[PDB]
Each structure stands twice: as structure tokens, then as C-alpha cells.
Symmetry: D3
Subunit: 166 residues, 6 copies
């Protein structure tokens, strides 16, 4: 009955995002997780495709004890009109009641559309910038990710990709 929504680039999905997700799941029955900027891939800032991130999330949420009945994973391309983005999200998702975001634009867009909006319950070393930097510089990127996500990154040759792009 009570459904939350979370949106992030997740480039890549790391232990931080997972902690936040589990924390949100203590307050809602179900969580809709949107992969934002689904159109961006193959850059230093945004290395992975939508599909690759769907894979990461799907595998990570399965490998941790979260029942499938409690979440949805949805890629969302950015669009040119901010005034349409909430409609875009709504079309691509189940009905939802509350939005979790610390981003002022996301907050205000959802808020103007009449949604309840609140900051994530947790703020997280576990950041995507650090993960990507470590992938580039042969640091310990693996320890920042769930093992299921490292397996995705090995399969898709994520490290080699990001190094070539740099």
C-alpha cells in the first residue's frame, strides 16, 4: 500500500546506495528505484549504460535479503523539459506516494505536482566519484561495491572501458 520513490544515476551502484535503499525500506512497503540519466554512457562521469545499471541493481537487490515484492527497478532517460519530467517518471513507474531526494530540483518538481517529498534517511568514501577514480587509478574499487556489482563490472569490462576513455 505505501510506496516510495528514489532516483539516482548510480554510476555505478555502490554500498552507499544499498544502505540508503534498506533504510528507506524500513519506512515504506515498496520502493521504486529509478536509474536516472539512463541515456548517458561511455564517459568518465557516466561510464555505464542503462542496461548495465539495471543489471547491477537487479543483481545487488537479489543477492541481499530483499524480497522481489518490495521493489521495482526502472531506467529513466533525462528529457529536455523539466516541467514534464515528473509525468515521464509517473508513466514509467507504478503509482507511488512519497519521493526521497536531497536534490533541490527533484524536490521542487515533485512537490509542485503534489507529492510528499523528503530527504533520504541516510547520508553516506562510498561515492561514485571515488569508485570511478579507483577504477581509473588501480585503487580498491571492489571494496566499495556489493560483490554482485563487481561481477557485473568484470563481465562488461568496465575498468578497461573507463581507462580507454581517459
Amino acid at each position: 500500500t505505501m510506496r516510495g520513490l528514489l532516483v539516482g544515476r548510480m554510476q555505478p551502484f555502490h554500498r552507499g546506495h544499498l544502505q540508503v535503499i534498506k533504510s528507506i525500506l524500513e519506512e515504506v512497503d515498496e520502493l521504486i528505484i529509478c536509474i536516472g540519466s539512463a541515456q548517458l554512457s561511455h564517459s568518465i562521469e557516466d561510464p555505464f549504460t542503462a542496461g548495465e545499471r539495471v543489471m547491477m541493481l537487479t543483481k545487488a537487490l537479489s543477492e541481499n535479503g530483499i524480497p522481489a515484492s518490495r521493489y521495482y527497478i526502472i531506467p529513466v532517460q533525462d528529457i529536455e523539459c523539466n516541467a514534464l519530467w515528473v509525468g515521464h517518471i509517473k508513466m514509467l513507474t507504478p503509482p507511488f506516494d512519497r519521493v526521497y531526494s536531497g536534490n533541490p530540483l527533484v524536490q521542487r518538481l515533485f512537490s509542485e505536482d503534489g507529492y510528499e517529498v523528503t530527504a533520504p534517511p541516510l547520508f553516506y568514501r562510498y561515492s561514485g566519484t571515488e569508485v570511478r577514480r579507483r577504477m581509473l587509478d588501480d585503487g580498491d574499487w571492489r571494496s566499495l561495491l556489493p560483490e554482485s556489482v563487481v561481477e557485473v563490472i568484470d563481465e562488461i569490462n568496465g575498468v578497461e572501458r573507463i581507462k580507454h576513455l581517459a
Copy 2:
């Protein structure tokens, strides 16, 4: 890890689709399920949104004891260029090895891109199809019996029947 792909409108997701899915899951480790024509909603032929169909699939696959580790559910908008549609799918999905489709165009597009392609292991009859489901929703027939219960619950929540009747 052997990964299949299936693509369909699923307007709505019915017991036929589910039967096909379970059959495919006997021959692959994981199945990527794409919801095609994700852009189309609010017509007699295509009543439900991408999001509504994501919900239907997610609930149905969960209610039937298929482990979450064995599937992916991905909305896919149609595009103008057929020659690009396979690239579009690939961008939106995990890597995959084999495509299941009875549709000649889908087959040929994937085959030209070097994918293994086969027909679905099962073919369901017209009486269990989306057309029959939608017709029964319109005419007060027994649409519920053609769907998994978890999907009927989605349709009740979103007022699907009222929608389709108004649109007609």
C-alpha cells in the same frame, strides 16, 4: 551464464505470457523480459502504461515463486528506425545470448545483428490472448480468469476496466 531475451507489449500480462516465460526459464539461466511499445497507453489496443505493465510483471513473477535472480523487467519504447531497434534494446538490457520471438521482423533484426534466434517454446491460443482479455474487460466477460491474481489486483488498483470502457 546463459541469458535469454523476450519482448512483448503485454497489454496486459496474462497467464499465456507467464506459461511461455516459465518454459523459457527451463532452457536459460536468466530471462530478460522487455515490455515493448512502452510509449503506448490509453487506447483499446494498448490500454496500460509502461509503469503499469512493469508493476504487473514484477508482481506476477514474484507471486509464482520465480527467484528474482533469474529475470529482468525492462520497459522499451518503440523507435522510428528498425535498423536501430536492436541497439536500443542492447543499451537498455544486460548482455544476452539468445532471443525468443515468433515475430518475423524481431527475428530478422536480431539475426542480422548476429544473435541466436528461436521461436518461443510454447504457443498459446487466441482464447487466452490479450485481445480476448481486453474484449472481456470491455464486454463484462470473465477477464479475471485469464490473468494471474497479482495482475488482476494491479488492474483493480489502477481502474483499468473503467479506463478501457471510457476509451471505447
Copy 3:
């Protein structure tokens, strides 16, 4: 304070549409008039451009005693996602309270978004099909339109266009 919305192709704007508009203006303070399928032009069914129809409406509503403070005229291209069309309209228009339409799809889309929806107060010989047929067959198309709209059609060579296209 109370604002209505009306949407139509208006190919072209005829006396019928004007009658409906004046009738709606007895029930609302302001009327937002959307020119639908703004992208379609240069066919038998849809001969005129968005701009040409903006012109027709702007001139017709000015030539009749309707104060400028009581209406807005807005071209609206169709989009691929029905579930986004109401958001599309909202982005392009002032805030509004009630929608006037006899079209089941328009009704249901607006209704699902929480808007009050009602049929036009008047139903109208004055139809666009008749107007276009008369333009093609040298009938009396002029008598079906406000004079300000006929002047637009003369300036843009509307009759010659539609005849060449046929």
C-alpha cells in the same frame, strides 16, 4: 480566477468553434484555447500550419467582442505518449480548473490527472470537413467562417494549397 480549457485541430477555425467558445465564456472567467495536432499541415484532412491557425484564432477572437483578458491561444503538437499529453498541455498553458471536451480519450486523460471534465455546452454544416470539401469543390466555404478567418485563408492561399494537394 476560474479558467477553462478547450482543445481542437481547428482546420480551419469556423463559426461553430466560435459559438462554442462564447458559450464556454458564460461559465468561466478565462478560456485557454489549444490548437491540437499543431504538427500536421499540408494534407486534405489538416491543411493549415500551427502558425496559420494561431493567426485565424487570434484574428477571430479580436474581431468579435471578446476581451483579450479572457483567453489564451496555444499551439500544441501531438506526442507519442498519451500518458504524458496532459503534462505537455500543462507546461504550455496557464493554470486551469476545468476541461471541456466531448472526446473520450481527452476526457479520460484529464480525468485521471484529477481535472474536472465536462462536454462542450454546445454541439454544432459548421464542420471542418464541410469547410474543406467546399474549398475543394468551389462551394460557399466563406459563409461557414468568420470574415477575419477568410482573410487569413486568402492571404496564405489556402484554397490553392488544398486544391493542389488533392
Copy 4:
């Protein structure tokens, strides 16, 4: 019938734009006013929607005794191809004879398409510009005095100040 064209973001519509418009109306019979970058809203640089700006213009031009027969107000989304933007404008507008712009790109695009192009008859200073208006909305300065009253009423109704402050 001599018809001018003007194009601007008008984020928001201020007394400067209005002054320019009235000056242009001394030398043309009718003025087509295009709201550029109609797609951009909900940023510090571009806070208001196309619709909100249509409202602002419609109300402001009405409140200043400019007859409705003398202008057109048209939202125009930007497009990726500069070489097509003039065609895009032409499709969305009545026929026109002369373009008023101080912007080199706008000038050149219209000039290459064979239109007469001239600079606006008036140039307003920075202190009356959209940047100053938005800055004052953010910093609790006197933004109201830079706008026609009809535009301030739009901004109150849509909670423009609260929006821009939250976005910052």
C-alpha cells in the same frame, strides 16, 4: 499589413521587454512575439514554464491598452539544428516581414533566409534585465518594481519566488 517578429526567453517578462515591444509597435502594424527556449523551466537562469510566460505576456499586453488585433504570442521550443530554426518559427507563426533582434545568430539565420533584420529600436540597461529581476527574487530585493503589475500577479499565483529560492 506589415508584420514584425520578436523572439526572447522573457524569464520573466519585465518592463524593459514591454518598452521594446511598444517601440516596435510604432513601426509595424502587428508584432509576433515568440517566447524562446519554451522547453526550459525550473532553473535559476530559466525559472518559468512556457505556459507561465504565455500568461505573463498575455496579461501584460492586455493591461497596457495594446489592442489584441496588434499582436500574437507564441511559445517556441529550441531545436538542435540552427539551420532549421527559422523554418520552425515560420511554421508556428503568421506570415511576417521583418525581424527585430540584437542577437548575431538570430540575425544571421533570418538574414540567410531572406528576411529583413534590424536591431530593436531600444536597448535597456542591465539593472532592468531578467538577470537583475531573478537576482532580486533570490535576494529579497525589489523585483516587483521591475515588472508590470500584471506580471507580479502571475508570479504570486504560481509561487515563482518560492520556486526560484528552493532551486537555489
Copy 5:
């Protein structure tokens, strides 16, 4: 320098299109050839991609001794606004003076933009048309005889007959 323009789907490029092109080249210095509906491929009506048709035209025009200095080959996707299509063409092509088309819509769109418009100098019969070519590809008829040999070679390389049969 007098420059003509021609626009067609060319699904595929056949001897008829070539005949028309050569006739136009008697009356202009250079001919801009646009491949219309460049977005459509992999249907019975529109089997070949933009790229495949570029290949067909490029090969056919080179095999028939038409100097390269006399033509341009340009893929053009359809767009949703008819009132923008001429601007779309203009952006994608060299400057041009005259448009060759028998199609009322194409004629009127170009004409409203101030271009001189005229019908093609030659009309080929249905028996030599793309519809006949495609039908023969499907039904194992003599499709090859309706195409320049360079185009047949393209169709063999890209497995065009196998494609259209599967579809």
C-alpha cells in the same frame, strides 16, 4: 551553376530511377539526389536501410560513367512537420535551383518556399517500378533484370532477398 534536386525512397534503386536521373542531367549542371524515408527499413514496402541505398546509388552512378562532379547523394529521414521538410532538405544539401517531382505534396511544399518545381522528364511504367522489383524478389521472379548490375551486387552482399522473404 544550375543545380536540380530529386527525392525518392528508391527501395531499391532500379533502372527506371537511373533513366530519370540521366534525363535530368541533360537539363542541369548538377543533380542532388535525396534518399527519402531514410528512417524506414526492414519492411516489405521499405526493405533497405539508408546506408544500403546510399551504397546502391553510389555504385550505380559510378558504374554508368556519370562524372562524380555532377551529383550528390543524400539520405533524408522523414519528419513529422510537412511545413519543415523543405528546410530539412535545404540543411542537408548543397544550394539548389529547381526541384523535379511528380508528387503533389513535394511540389507544393517546395513551391510555397519559392522554388521552381517541375515534373520529371520521364515516367517509367509499373512493370519497372520498386513494387514490381520487390514482388519479384519475394516470388522468385526476374528482379535482377530490373536493376543495374552494381545494385544487384549490393543486394547479394546484404542478403536483401533473404531479408524480404523472412519479413
Copy 6:
């Protein structure tokens, strides 16, 4: 038949690009030349339209005795998804075997799709580059000497220098 691919903005087409093209033509039977960022025109960085650049390439390659049977010229608009760009190119071009690029992104995108990728055989200096050409157009320098004469003629016809100065 061994077919190479090259992709560049070519704003405008200069002697450097031509030198590279001729070097590539020693190693392949045919070269597909894509005009990238075909959507961008009327800026200081990207002054010329797709059509104008098609004209430049078509004229330059014909003026230098490269037979028409050895190349294809294809405008290619950028797209928002990098993961789709190779599919976009493939749709718009003949089949090809090898990609020539020094750009890491272009290399990796093509490489991930299974194409052989190699750097161009020749690198020209900054002094002969598009940036230098455009700068000289702006500052009344000797831009003409950096271009094939056929390209200069295009630029005169389309009033390219006047455009870039106004911008």
C-alpha cells in the same frame, strides 16, 4: 572488398583531411567518410551545415582524381546515447570492416561493437587544422591556402566568411 570508415566534423574540409583520406585509400578498397555533428551549424566552432560539408567533400574528392567507386560521403547527426551511435552509423552507411580514428570514445564504441579500430595513418599539425582555418577566416588571414580550391569555391558561394564574421 575491404571497406574503411572515417568520421569527422570537417568544419570545413581542409587539405589535412584530404591528405589523411588519400593515405587511408592506400590501405582499403573503399572509404566511407562520415560527416559528424551534422546537426551543428552557424557557430564559430561549427559554422557550416551538413549540406555545405557534403558539397565540400563531394567537390574536393572529385577535383583530386579519386574515383567515385572508392568512397561514400554520409552526413551523421550526433545522438544523445553513446551506446547507440555505432548502430546509428551502421544504419546510415554501407557495410564496413575497419574504423580509422584517433579519438578514444570513437575507438572504444566501435571496438565494443567488434570492429577493428586503428589510428589514422597520418597526423597533421595544428597550423593546418579547422581551428586555424576558422581563425584565419575571422581575422582576414590566409585561410584559402589551407583548403582545396574546390572547397574555397563552396565557401565563396555560401558566403561562409561573412557568416562566421557576423556570428
